Amino acid sequence: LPTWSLDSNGEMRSRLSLSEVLDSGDLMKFAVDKTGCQFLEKAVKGSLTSYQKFQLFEQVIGRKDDFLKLSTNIFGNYLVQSVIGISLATNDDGYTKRQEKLKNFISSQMTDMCLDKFACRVIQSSLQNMDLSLACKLVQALPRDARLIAICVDQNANHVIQKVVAVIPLKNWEFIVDFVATPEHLRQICSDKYGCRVVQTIIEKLTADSMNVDLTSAAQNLRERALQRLMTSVTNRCQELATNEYANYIIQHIVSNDDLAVYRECIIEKCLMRNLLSLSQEKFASHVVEKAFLHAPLELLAEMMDEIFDGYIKDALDIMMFHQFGNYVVQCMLTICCDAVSGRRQTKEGGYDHAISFQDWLKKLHSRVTKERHRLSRFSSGKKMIETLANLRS
RNA sequence: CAUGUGCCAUA
């Protein structure tokens, strides 16, 4: 901090002015200093004359090098967002130029700023506050190669992609959907702790749910077409996704969402069916199996139940009943059946009552749990299944 | 086995 501004105690002189700092050529020293930056933030929220604004704009968002330096600064990035805000609230002559130049600064460094812990905040703030059409030009600056993968899986940049999805029209980021649907890209991105959230955020935005009812018919169709292209890639590789430590969260989201019923059903048929015993024994896939049971249409559910009770290859029911992960599936099956039988769960579909089927499945589980109660009583899951059945009796 | 998975990030 420049000596001219300081005390005999080395503290910023009370009554130091914003104009003083602006006139001194030393704004950059204050802006990267914890204390100076706090001063500057208070100063710029005040009432600024035309000239103070002129200098603020030119010094904070008008010089490329200093702009990037501040945007990638731990304290400075805050001044930059505040100054961008002021600049958008100021409809003076140079309103457009400034905003155009800001777009250009950012665009020329999109990747690095996206990946930067501090500059990614400048990016998110600009996407949200800039006029739509300038914001859309920022989006076009995103890389379309391996760097876009690195962005979607980055701890900082993933929030940029999520912000794009939240505030930018689909027409302008449609490329991202197809980039992600590229089979190899989908794999790398869904199997990542950040990537899997980004993909879910994209799916949610592409879902014809209650948050999309304001869309026009053109917009709904654009949304639907993209949804279909993404889902095609998702369902083609759902086996791989369903068993991954991260991607299983995506498969569960789809399976559990009524607004995506058709994809739920495709996924159940394409990768779960005929694999229930195997998948119910996996750490990650077991949770997807539980979802399937909870949300499957009754027709498929019946095939799922039959697969367990009379499936191929110390029977399947026994394996799952006592397995460390499988017991959570059997419990789910049981709860489903008890709920149905006590009317807590709907048993009718397509104009017909599937109650006798539930009745059959319950019967089977009761008879098995009755015969195995000595072993089941050794386990927490077993105790619970026994008790579920006892409070049914009531 | 009284049992089994994630991310939601800046002064």
Q: Is the CB of A124 under 7 A from strand B?
A: yes
Q: How far is CA A96 from CA A11, A56, A100, in A?
A: 39, 16, 6
Distance A242 CA to B6 C1' (A): 14
Q: How many domains does chain A have?
A: 1
C-alpha A309/C-alpha A318 separation (Å) is 10
**Method used to solve the structure:** X-ray
Q: How far is CA A16 from CA A7, A19, A265, in A?
A: 10, 9, 67
Q: Which nucleotides of B are covered by protein (CB under 7 A)?
A: 1-11
The amino acid occupying position A41 is E
Residues 318-357 of A with CB under 7 A from strand B: 321-325, 327-329, 331
Domain extent for A149: 1-394
- What is the per-residue burial (b if ≥16 Cβ within 10 Å, else e) of A353-363? ebeebbeebbe
- Closest-lying nucleotide for A246 based on CA to C1': B6
C-alpha A40/C-alpha A186 separation (Å) is 44
CATH code for position A191: 1.25.10.10
- What is the per-residue burial (b if ≥16 Cβ within 10 Å, else e) of A242-268? bbbebbbbbbbbbbebeebeebbbbbb
Contact A237, A191 (CB under 8 A): no
